[PDB]
Every structure is written in C-alpha cells, then in structure tokens.
C-alpha cells in the first residue's frame, strides 16, 4: 500500500496501544516509531487507504482515555515522493 | 493596473499577484492570520475555503 | 528558487501534514524536518517566493486545528548566504 | 520553466483570445494550449511560476469579465500532478 | 483496485481542478479526460474502492465552488469486462 | 499591418457578411475563420490598427439585423507572439 | 458564377430542403453543406446574382416552416477575394 | 527573472535605503539607479514576479518615513523587448 | 510610420508604465526618453497614426492613477522636417 | 531671415506644440531647443518678422490649452548681433 | 569581529528569522544554532560590539511577535578564549 | 568599515558641513558626494557600525540649525555587493 496512517500521544503506553490496535485492525505494516520530546510519541504505519482509515479509527477509539490520551490522528492516502525522507 | 495597500498602510500598485474573487483556487488559508514577513496587501481577501 | 519557507508546531503531526500540504500546494521542496525539543517540531522548505507563500499559507492556515495545533509559520524570500549552516 | 498551471474558461472564443492576450501581456507564462470544450466553451492553459500565474490570471480575469459573454471559471493550479499533463495532453 | 471513479462537470476548468483533487486526495490514476460535447467534461480514474471514494469526495468538495458547479458524480466499484470497451 | 481584429456571431450568414464588411471597409487580410462550436463562429483578420478598427466597426453594425446578431465584438492592436501558435 | 447564396437553419433537414429549392429554383452550383455545431447547419451555393437571389427567395419561402426552419438568409452579390479562402 | 520592480522617492537617502530593502527582501538585481531631477530619485530591480512583488512591497514598508518618504512604488511584470534602451 | 506620440509625467515610474502601455497596447517604435528636470519625465514613441493614437489613449488611461500622475498626453501625425532634429 | 522668434513653457509638451506650430504656420527655421530646468522648456526659431509673428501667434493660441499651459511667448523684431554668439 | 551576540527563544523559527535580522542588520557572522532543550533554541554570532549590538537589537525587535517570543537577548563584547571549547 | 551612513540636506552648505561633521566625529571614509537636483545634496560615508552611528548622530545634531536643515539622515550597516554598482 501507499497510504500512511499515523497517531501520536502523550507517553509511550498509548503509543503502543494505538500501534497494537492498528496492526490488529487493518492490512497495515508498521514502519515508524518516533520519540518527539516532552512525551510526544508518534506511530506511523503504511497500508492501503481503507486499511489506513480503519486502523487509525480503531486505534484512536481504543486509545481514548487510556494514559494521558491522544492528541490527534490522520489518514493520508499519498505523501509525495519527497515526503518519505522525513521518515 | 491593480492597486494594494501595504502592511503599514502605504500605497502600492502594479500587476500585484494578490487575491481576487473572479479567480478561484487561492482561497485556502489566505483569509486567516497573516504569517511572518509579508506579501499580501492589508486589503482583506475573499474566503470560501471550498 | 531559494525562497525559504517555514512551518512550526508542537508535535510533528501537524508539522508533517503541513508538509504534505506543502508538497501538494505549490512547487516548494522541503529540505529539513527538525525536532526542536519539548515536542516542538519544524519543517523547512525551499521554493519560489510566491510558491512559498501559497504553499505555507495554505498548509499552516489549514492545519491549525489539527490536534494540539500549529504554533507559528513564517517565510523568508532570501536567507543570507552566511545562514547556510542552519540548512 | 515555471510549471504552475494558469488556466481559465470563457463562453465564446473572443473572451478567450483577449483574456489570453492579457495573460501573456501580464506575466511570463507560456501559452501551452487552447481547447474547445463544446458549445462555445473555450479553456486556455498556460504554464509559469506561481506569482506570475497569479498576476496574469487576475489580469486576464478582470479584462475578460465583460468581453463577450464573459468569464466562466478562472483557476490556478500550482502543482500539476505528474500524471495530469499526460491526461491533459502534455 | 479496478474501482472506477468518474466526475462530470461544467466545462474543462472544474474537470482539471477535480483531477488535481483526484491526484492529491488518494491513490488513483487518470485513465480518461473526455469532452462530451455541449460543455460537459468528464474525468475517469481507477483505483481501490475506498481510495477512489475518498478521492471523488475530495474532487466534488473542490469543484462546487469552482466555476459553474458540479453536474454529476458517480462511483462504479465493479466495472464489468463489457464496460472496458467503453473506456 | 500587425494589428489583429476579431469578432463572434451565431452561424455563418453573419460571419461571412462580417468578413465581407472586413474586406470592403478596410484593406486588411483575413487570417482565420474558427468554428468554436455550438453555433459559435468567430472571424480573425489582420491589418493596421486604424484599418482594423474601421473594418470591425463596419462589420459590427452590419450583423445585428443579420441572423441572431453579434455576440462578441473586440479589437486589439498588439497581440503577443505567444498567441501566434494559437493562430 | 461568383455570387454567394448561403443559408442557416436548425438541423440539416430544412438545409436539404433549402438546397432542393436551390437546385430546382435556378441553375446554381452548391459549394457545400456544413454542420456548424449545436444543430446549426449552413448551406452555401454559388451562381449568378439574379439566379442566386431567386434561389434564396425560394428557399426562404420553402424551408421556413419545417421544424424550426430558416434562421438566417441573405446574399452576397460580389464577394471579396479575401473572403473566399474561408470556403 | 525578468520582471521589473520600480520605486521612486524624493532624495537619494530614501532611494538607497529602498535599494537596501530590495537586496534584503528577495532575489532582485538592481539594474539602474538614476536621478530624474528636482529631487526625484529612481531605483529599479529585476527578478521573478513574485520575488519582485515581495521585494518592492518590503521596500515600500521600509521607505515610508525615511525623510521625505515614499512617492511611488508602482511596478510591472514584464518589460517589453524594446524598452531596454529606455531602461 | 511618421506619427509621433509622447507622454509627460512626474517621476520616472509613471513614465515607464506609460511606455509599457505604448509598447504593449499597439505596434509603435519608442524613439526615446527625456529627463526634462524638476521631476518631469517624457517618453517619445513613433508609429502610424492609428497605432500612436490607440497607444497614447491606453497609456493615459493606465497612467491616470499611477504614482503622482500624468501631465499631458498628445499625438502628432505629421512632424515637420526641422522638428525631427529636436529628437 | 534675421528676426528671432521665441517661445517657452512649463513642460516640453506645449514646447513641441509650439515648435510644430512654428513650422506649420509658416516657413521658419528652428535654431534652439533648451532644457532650462525645473520644467521650463524653450524653443528658438529664426525667420522673417511677419512669418515669426504669425508662427508665435499660432503657437500661443494653440498650445495653452494643451498640458499645464504656456508661460511665456515673446517676439523680437530687431535681434541685436551681440545676442547671436550667446546663441 | 570576536565579540559575541546571541539570541534565545522558544521554537527555532523566531531564532532563525532573528538570525536573518542579525545578518541583514550588521556585519556579523553567525557561528551556531543550538537546540537548548524543551523548545529552547539559541543562535550564536561573532562580530564587533557595535555591529553586535545593532544586529542583536534588530533581531530582538523583529523576533518577539514570531512564535513564543524571546527568552533572552544578550551580548558580551569580550569573550574569553577559554570559553571557546564550549562553543 | 562596511557600514554606510548617508545624509540628505537642502543645499551644498548643509551637505558639506555634515560631511565635515562625519569626518571630525568618527572613523569614516567619504565615498559619495551626490547632487540630487533641486537643492537636495546627499553625502555617503563608510565606516564601522558604531563609528557610523556616532558620526551620523553628530551630523544629524549638526544639520538642524544650518540653513534649511536636514531632509533625510539614515544609517545602514550592510551594503550588499550588488549595491556597489549603485555606489
């Protein structure tokens, strides 16, 4: 796939929670795990657009109040060829 | 000749590639808070995110 | 060509979505993705002055409400050559 | 060398021609094409960098809004996708 | 995917901006640009069902405020082999 | 002469009589007779600016009683070389 | 003969009726029939001025009742040499 | 870039500080600093249209209160091929 | 041809914009520019009577509101022999 | 001849109407074209008393309404020799 | 110059545009951009103390509105050699 | 000493007294003595940023009571290499 699912939160706990939710809920291959600073942690996964949407929504739903919570999530279907160097 | 007003209120003119309601496409973001530096006239721009 | 465009938020998720908006909005090449620290993240693009304007304007002013939000955006038509090490 | 797309629509070819004339008098945009949509609709297409495209498209618009039937749609592509022009006729 | 998305609009300008929305929204490939006649222009793209659905949503949402407006917009997810000669 | 005069009308009766008025009123040379489509007919003549204007005035007043009449009358003096490949 | 007779109508059936009036009203040669676009159809014939006038009057009196019928009908006595390249 | 930016003032001091704003704003090369007379002083720049726009605009934002201040900052987007001796 | 058109303004910016109007509106040959003094700048252009008139007309229309304004716009069609060495 | 005709004005536009009025009114030869400064522009001609009188009358009666207006138009009958090498 | 000027802010966007102010305000060479931590960013520049003061004040005055604003603007006119290993 | 100080004065007397103040106050070199026209005279000195600051402070405090006084006194510390053609 080419679509990029992606979630980010406070602390690594909800990060791996969203990751486990995505890898269980969609045809998605986890490809990036970023420690951002100040507790911001981002998990970014690659898969088809429908799978990306399903995984993102499932992770966000199962990750709502646990830990310190999400801050956002998004469904990108195609980053440009020049965006993948950022990951 | 098209006209515009500078960020400090001064008077400028020319081709002035600003925002016009006749042309669509340059709607997203033009309306909200102005960024650093400056390129767009103090003249308010149409919205219609679309 | 050498116009330098800037996007700055807390958390790299609005940053990279502004970056996708950059590479989808105007002919600007992103040349850096920097982790400020404490959760602050920055994307650093290059392109034509009007292109930088269109891109940065659209992306930053569209992604403000994405999660915890963008903090600031800025544009430089010509950085000084001596400011090269920052690149 | 500018690849941003400045391209507009007119009812009738008279506004198309005079609007394209203003287009190429108002910026350095290469007139890449004229297309007859059908029923008198004419779309003109030029390539150039974003600022030149913006200025020239604006000028063509406020020149053509009155000529003949008038303008129909004036739009500015800044990032034509790699696949669009082959479907656009290159 | 072989899902076929396709958009009809008032003349060529909304068609081109809709194709822009196609190529910037989700994974689709422009298979056709057709001038029906009498001012109608249609764009034909292929891809996965969900991706094409998101793409055509974005294309419409772009086209309503462009020019004279949208005419028609449909999502065929299973083009039969008998339809292929028509495309 | 490099000035380009040109007009629009409904059908060929007004177009041909307008071309005749072009030729009789001023000693200019016609360069194009274009079928825009949907009954849209345009004529494109070449001559010096005064002759262009006079001929176009004569053709313009000579078509309202002819057929459906004139739709778009226009004179320009200096077209750019970029328009020539479209001519 | 160089005199031009030439008629506009809606749909080519009244155009064929007008050409029929041409061919049994006077001995005048036809230079062509053409589909203008949008349903407009133009018939153009050449002949002597009196024969052209009589034929055109006959066609106007004949084809104006069929469907929408005649749209524009006028003659040119001695067309200019610059006009004929359009034919 | 060939777009010409133009700005006029009264006195050499505002003109030269406007030229400073030119060289610090965007990629604009000053091709001529000429003296009209009677206090009127001219500065020109050459560059891309967007860069020229930003530069001239910044120059205006810089020259407003420099002694006499701004007089005229009107600009163009393309000089003609003939105006070079007039430049 | 021999018709002389010429434009007077104060400040060089309106002068060059009037000259651009001359050489973009009609086909004329700009014969020169003159710095009169006291801020007075004039552009002298050459061409046929219709082109010169149309050019100066368009230039006056454009140059009314630019900068600090136009002074006088005039047309000469038959310059005398001893008048030329003044140029 | 020997008589000296002279006319000066604010701006060079009315100066050139003065000059060509000199030439058209009668046969008189121009001897001087002066840019005095501060907007004052001057022209000097040499001819017979009646011819120069008629010329200067025509110029002063023609160019005042043109531009900002004439400011001085004198005529001398017996030009002294001592003024000649000052010219 | 060997004297130190230096700027601190939150997010490097105000830092880098203040560095642009440094290098457009006075003849100063920047030596470093450093991520202090927790969003704290500093810029370090060489220069003579007059240029140091001018540039540092320019950056401070052009930097407060951008992002989170300043944290500290500081100058030292006599940096020790022993401090360099920390730079 | 790259910093460029410049003073605009009503006449040559305030200009040269200002230049003398420049040369007596701080270490600068006089690079420019320009006569704008209409009485405006501009003086251009180069030197160290603080040196130019003190010098032109002295000159501005010099010129208020001399004749018609100042018009525009300004200071720029960074003349670009491309500005040298204007110097």
PDB file of N, CA and C in Angstrom, chain F residues 10-48:
ATOM      1  N   UNK F  10     -23.440  34.197 -34.431  1.00  0.00           N
ATOM      2  CA  UNK F  10     -24.257  32.986 -34.453  1.00  0.00           C
ATOM      3  C   UNK F  10     -24.424  32.527 -35.896  1.00  0.00           C
ATOM      4  N   UNK F  11     -23.752  31.445 -36.263  1.00  0.00           N
ATOM      5  CA  UNK F  11     -23.890  30.894 -37.593  1.00  0.00           C
ATOM      6  C   UNK F  11     -23.005  31.595 -38.605  1.00  0.00           C
ATOM      7  N   UNK F  12     -23.118  31.144 -39.854  1.00  0.00           N
ATOM      8  CA  UNK F  12     -22.177  31.587 -40.874  1.00  0.00           C
ATOM      9  C   UNK F  12     -22.701  32.736 -41.720  1.00  0.00           C
ATOM     10  N   UNK F  13     -24.010  32.964 -41.773  1.00  0.00           N
ATOM     11  CA  UNK F  13     -24.501  34.102 -42.549  1.00  0.00           C
ATOM     12  C   UNK F  13     -23.878  35.376 -41.979  1.00  0.00           C
ATOM     13  N   UNK F  14     -24.016  35.654 -40.672  1.00  0.00           N
ATOM     14  CA  UNK F  14     -23.359  36.850 -40.130  1.00  0.00           C
ATOM     15  C   UNK F  14     -21.851  36.799 -40.227  1.00  0.00           C
ATOM     16  N   UNK F  15     -21.241  35.622 -40.085  1.00  0.00           N
ATOM     17  CA  UNK F  15     -19.786  35.535 -40.154  1.00  0.00           C
ATOM     18  C   UNK F  15     -19.276  35.923 -41.536  1.00  0.00           C
ATOM     19  N   UNK F  16     -19.917  35.408 -42.582  1.00  0.00           N
ATOM     20  CA  UNK F  16     -19.469  35.685 -43.940  1.00  0.00           C
ATOM     21  C   UNK F  16     -19.749  37.133 -44.311  1.00  0.00           C
ATOM     22  N   UNK F  17     -20.924  37.657 -43.944  1.00  0.00           N
ATOM     23  CA  UNK F  17     -21.161  39.064 -44.254  1.00  0.00           C
ATOM     24  C   UNK F  17     -20.234  39.967 -43.447  1.00  0.00           C
ATOM     25  N   UNK F  18     -19.869  39.558 -42.230  1.00  0.00           N
ATOM     26  CA  UNK F  18     -18.911  40.320 -41.447  1.00  0.00           C
ATOM     27  C   UNK F  18     -17.531  40.294 -42.081  1.00  0.00           C
ATOM     28  N   UNK F  19     -17.116  39.148 -42.622  1.00  0.00           N
ATOM     29  CA  UNK F  19     -15.848  39.093 -43.342  1.00  0.00           C
ATOM     30  C   UNK F  19     -15.884  39.979 -44.581  1.00  0.00           C
ATOM     31  N   UNK F  20     -17.016  39.989 -45.285  1.00  0.00           N
ATOM     32  CA  UNK F  20     -17.157  40.875 -46.434  1.00  0.00           C
ATOM     33  C   UNK F  20     -17.050  42.334 -46.013  1.00  0.00           C
ATOM     34  N   UNK F  21     -17.666  42.689 -44.885  1.00  0.00           N
ATOM     35  CA  UNK F  21     -17.530  44.045 -44.366  1.00  0.00           C
ATOM     36  C   UNK F  21     -16.087  44.337 -43.976  1.00  0.00           C
ATOM     37  N   UNK F  22     -15.403  43.350 -43.391  1.00  0.00           N
ATOM     38  CA  UNK F  22     -13.985  43.496 -43.087  1.00  0.00           C
ATOM     39  C   UNK F  22     -13.227  43.902 -44.338  1.00  0.00           C
ATOM     40  N   UNK F  23     -13.429  43.147 -45.416  1.00  0.00           N
ATOM     41  CA  UNK F  23     -12.669  43.359 -46.639  1.00  0.00           C
ATOM     42  C   UNK F  23     -13.035  44.672 -47.315  1.00  0.00           C
ATOM     43  N   UNK F  24     -14.323  45.007 -47.366  1.00  0.00           N
ATOM     44  CA  UNK F  24     -14.748  46.201 -48.084  1.00  0.00           C
ATOM     45  C   UNK F  24     -14.400  47.474 -47.323  1.00  0.00           C
ATOM     46  N   UNK F  25     -14.656  47.498 -46.013  1.00  0.00           N
ATOM     47  CA  UNK F  25     -14.404  48.706 -45.236  1.00  0.00           C
ATOM     48  C   UNK F  25     -12.923  49.045 -45.179  1.00  0.00           C
ATOM     49  N   UNK F  26     -12.067  48.044 -44.998  1.00  0.00           N
ATOM     50  CA  UNK F  26     -10.640  48.291 -44.880  1.00  0.00           C
ATOM     51  C   UNK F  26      -9.886  47.226 -45.655  1.00  0.00           C
ATOM     52  N   UNK F  27      -8.695  47.599 -46.115  1.00  0.00           N
ATOM     53  CA  UNK F  27      -7.857  46.701 -46.906  1.00  0.00           C
ATOM     54  C   UNK F  27      -6.950  45.900 -45.971  1.00  0.00           C
ATOM     55  N   UNK F  28      -7.577  44.948 -45.283  1.00  0.00           N
ATOM     56  CA  UNK F  28      -6.898  44.060 -44.352  1.00  0.00           C
ATOM     57  C   UNK F  28      -6.969  42.643 -44.902  1.00  0.00           C
ATOM     58  N   UNK F  29      -6.167  41.762 -44.314  1.00  0.00           N
ATOM     59  CA  UNK F  29      -6.109  40.364 -44.716  1.00  0.00           C
ATOM     60  C   UNK F  29      -6.654  39.481 -43.602  1.00  0.00           C
ATOM     61  N   UNK F  30      -7.555  38.573 -43.965  1.00  0.00           N
ATOM     62  CA  UNK F  30      -8.139  37.645 -43.011  1.00  0.00           C
ATOM     63  C   UNK F  30      -7.199  36.470 -42.788  1.00  0.00           C
ATOM     64  N   UNK F  31      -7.030  36.087 -41.526  1.00  0.00           N
ATOM     65  CA  UNK F  31      -6.124  35.003 -41.170  1.00  0.00           C
ATOM     66  C   UNK F  31      -6.833  33.791 -40.589  1.00  0.00           C
ATOM     67  N   UNK F  32      -8.082  33.911 -40.149  1.00  0.00           N
ATOM     68  CA  UNK F  32      -8.741  32.775 -39.535  1.00  0.00           C
ATOM     69  C   UNK F  32     -10.245  32.893 -39.557  1.00  0.00           C
ATOM     70  N   UNK F  33     -10.901  31.749 -39.719  1.00  0.00           N
ATOM     71  CA  UNK F  33     -12.348  31.627 -39.573  1.00  0.00           C
ATOM     72  C   UNK F  33     -12.587  30.381 -38.737  1.00  0.00           C
ATOM     73  N   UNK F  34     -12.843  30.563 -37.446  1.00  0.00           N
ATOM     74  CA  UNK F  34     -12.810  29.461 -36.499  1.00  0.00           C
ATOM     75  C   UNK F  34     -14.215  29.093 -36.044  1.00  0.00           C
ATOM     76  N   UNK F  35     -14.474  27.789 -35.992  1.00  0.00           N
ATOM     77  CA  UNK F  35     -15.742  27.246 -35.520  1.00  0.00           C
ATOM     78  C   UNK F  35     -15.562  26.868 -34.059  1.00  0.00           C
ATOM     79  N   UNK F  36     -16.003  27.749 -33.163  1.00  0.00           N
ATOM     80  CA  UNK F  36     -15.844  27.488 -31.739  1.00  0.00           C
ATOM     81  C   UNK F  36     -16.673  26.282 -31.320  1.00  0.00           C
ATOM     82  N   UNK F  37     -17.867  26.139 -31.884  1.00  0.00           N
ATOM     83  CA  UNK F  37     -18.728  25.026 -31.543  1.00  0.00           C
ATOM     84  C   UNK F  37     -20.033  25.475 -30.922  1.00  0.00           C
ATOM     85  N   UNK F  38     -21.094  24.701 -31.130  1.00  0.00           N
ATOM     86  CA  UNK F  38     -22.398  25.089 -30.627  1.00  0.00           C
ATOM     87  C   UNK F  38     -22.934  26.356 -31.251  1.00  0.00           C
ATOM     88  N   UNK F  39     -22.732  26.537 -32.555  1.00  0.00           N
ATOM     89  CA  UNK F  39     -23.183  27.724 -33.245  1.00  0.00           C
ATOM     90  C   UNK F  39     -22.278  28.924 -33.097  1.00  0.00           C
ATOM     91  N   UNK F  40     -21.210  28.811 -32.314  1.00  0.00           N
ATOM     92  CA  UNK F  40     -20.290  29.919 -32.112  1.00  0.00           C
ATOM     93  C   UNK F  40     -19.331  30.012 -33.293  1.00  0.00           C
ATOM     94  N   UNK F  41     -19.353  31.136 -34.015  1.00  0.00           N
ATOM     95  CA  UNK F  41     -18.471  31.329 -35.161  1.00  0.00           C
ATOM     96  C   UNK F  41     -17.676  32.607 -34.947  1.00  0.00           C
ATOM     97  N   UNK F  42     -16.355  32.532 -35.108  1.00  0.00           N
ATOM     98  CA  UNK F  42     -15.521  33.711 -34.936  1.00  0.00           C
ATOM     99  C   UNK F  42     -14.668  33.945 -36.173  1.00  0.00           C
ATOM    100  N   UNK F  43     -14.334  35.211 -36.398  1.00  0.00           N
ATOM    101  CA  UNK F  43     -13.501  35.614 -37.522  1.00  0.00           C
ATOM    102  C   UNK F  43     -12.315  36.411 -36.995  1.00  0.00           C
ATOM    103  N   UNK F  44     -11.165  36.230 -37.652  1.00  0.00           N
ATOM    104  CA  UNK F  44      -9.861  36.720 -37.222  1.00  0.00           C
ATOM    105  C   UNK F  44      -9.180  37.351 -38.426  1.00  0.00           C
ATOM    106  N   UNK F  45      -9.030  38.675 -38.415  1.00  0.00           N
ATOM    107  CA  UNK F  45      -8.450  39.415 -39.525  1.00  0.00           C
ATOM    108  C   UNK F  45      -7.220  40.179 -39.047  1.00  0.00           C
ATOM    109  N   UNK F  46      -6.329  40.455 -39.999  1.00  0.00           N
ATOM    110  CA  UNK F  46      -5.031  41.070 -39.749  1.00  0.00           C
ATOM    111  C   UNK F  46      -4.894  42.327 -40.597  1.00  0.00           C
ATOM    112  N   UNK F  47      -4.484  43.423 -39.968  1.00  0.00           N
ATOM    113  CA  UNK F  47      -4.290  44.678 -40.674  1.00  0.00           C
ATOM    114  C   UNK F  47      -3.746  45.720 -39.721  1.00  0.00           C
ATOM    115  N   UNK F  48      -3.586  46.937 -40.233  1.00  0.00           N
ATOM    116  CA  UNK F  48      -3.098  48.001 -39.371  1.00  0.00           C
ATOM    117  C   UNK F  48      -4.225  48.501 -38.471  1.00  0.00           C
TER     118      UNK F  48
END
